[PDB]
Design a protein around this ligand. Structure first.
Ligand code: NAG
Ligand code: 8K2
Ligand code: NA
Ligand code: NA
Lengths: 11, 28, 250
């Protein structure tokens, strides 16, 4: 149930 | 490290959290 | 955390969430000990019996959080890992002896009202405070009961337990690198860490200098909040020479 985190932290 | 363990919203303001006294009272 | 309460804002500004990138999920707690170093339990990263062996690129750390599941825009900070260091004598085969790991961040985190490091104990603070009956504080986003999940960070205060009682509560071999905490069945209060809290901090507030010290790391338990069982914690001071060696070398 986690809100998506900004894509920059997954790049 | 110099400032470690002193919380901005508590110790740095001289405000006490709702249960820290329970810890102090146990340090007999 | 079982039988705890909601944390106050900024109550545990050293609390860190270890977050799996894919699938996005909570893995463990952790703590901030400087602008570039995070402390956790080794078993949060390496546990071969469960096929667990996370590498740096699998994980993120989220610092300054209160809500478990929300992205706390303008408050939390998310850091990538430069390097993981597991204690070389971490005993995952038997009893989780020396259950400690460090994570170096790729870039330093900015401190704020919500982000601030905890102290690590010196010998004298450890000797003075690690006594049966003295209470510490455990925090985390783990489950609310053994058999569910919190909206916000939870907090519980628990007494350190006499070593013979710790040993007599379990069949596991207890070492000097562990201590246990929790209420006894006859004490009429309850509380424990639970699944998802491991790796997070057990802290005590020194009455000598009014600073918070991390005395333990949430390590292991048999169930959660069971009568006659206790939570077990890595003894941070006993392993501090290794911490210092890692930080000095790297
Ligand atoms: C953990 O994984 C790394 C590579 O990802 C490997 O080199 C190491 O031997 C593994 N450790 C164990 C205990 O399996
Ligand atoms: N077994 S567990 O829920 O991770 C746990 C309970 C108490 C701990 Cl200390 S760690
Ligand atoms: Na025993
Ligand atoms: Na118990």
């Amino acid at each position: 149930d986690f809100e998506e985190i900004p894509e920059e932290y997954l790049q | 490290e110099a400032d470690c363990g002193l919380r901005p919203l508590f110790e740095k303001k001289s405000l006490e959290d709702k249960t820290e006294r329970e810890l102090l009272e146990s340090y007999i | 955390i079982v039988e705890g309460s909601d944390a106050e804002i900024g109550m545990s500004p050293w609390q860190v969430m270890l977050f799996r990138k894919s699938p996005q999920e909570l893995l463990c707690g952790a703590s901030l000990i400087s602008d570039r170093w995070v402390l956790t339990a080794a078993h949060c990263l390496l546990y071969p019996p469960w096929d667990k062996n996370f590498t740096e690129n699998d994980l993120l750390v989220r610092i300054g959080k209160h809500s478990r599941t929300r992205y706390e825009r303008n408050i939390e900070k998310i850091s990538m890992l430069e390097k993981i260091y597991i204690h070389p004598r971490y005993n995952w085969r038997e009893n989780l002896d020396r259950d400690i790991a460090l994570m170096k961040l790729k870039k330093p985190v900015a401190f704020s009202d919500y982000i601030h490091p905890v102290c690590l104990p010196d010998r004298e603070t450890a000797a003075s405070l690690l006594q049966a009956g003295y209470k510490g504080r455990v925090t985390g986003w783990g489950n609310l009961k053994e058999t569910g999940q919190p909206s916000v960070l939870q907090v519980v205060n628990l007494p350190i337990v006499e070593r013979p009682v710790c040993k007599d509560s379990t069949r596991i071999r207890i070492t000097d690198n562990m201590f246990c905490a929790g209420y006894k069945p006859d004490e009429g209060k309850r509380g424990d860490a639970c699944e998802g809290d491991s790796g997070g901090p057990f802290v005590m507030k020194s009455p000598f200098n009014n600073r918070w010290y991390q005395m333990g790391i949430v390590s292991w338990g048999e169930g959660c909040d069971r009568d006659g069982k206790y939570g077990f914690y890595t003894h941070v001071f006993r392993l501090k020479k290794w911490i210092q060696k890692v930080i000095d070398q790297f």
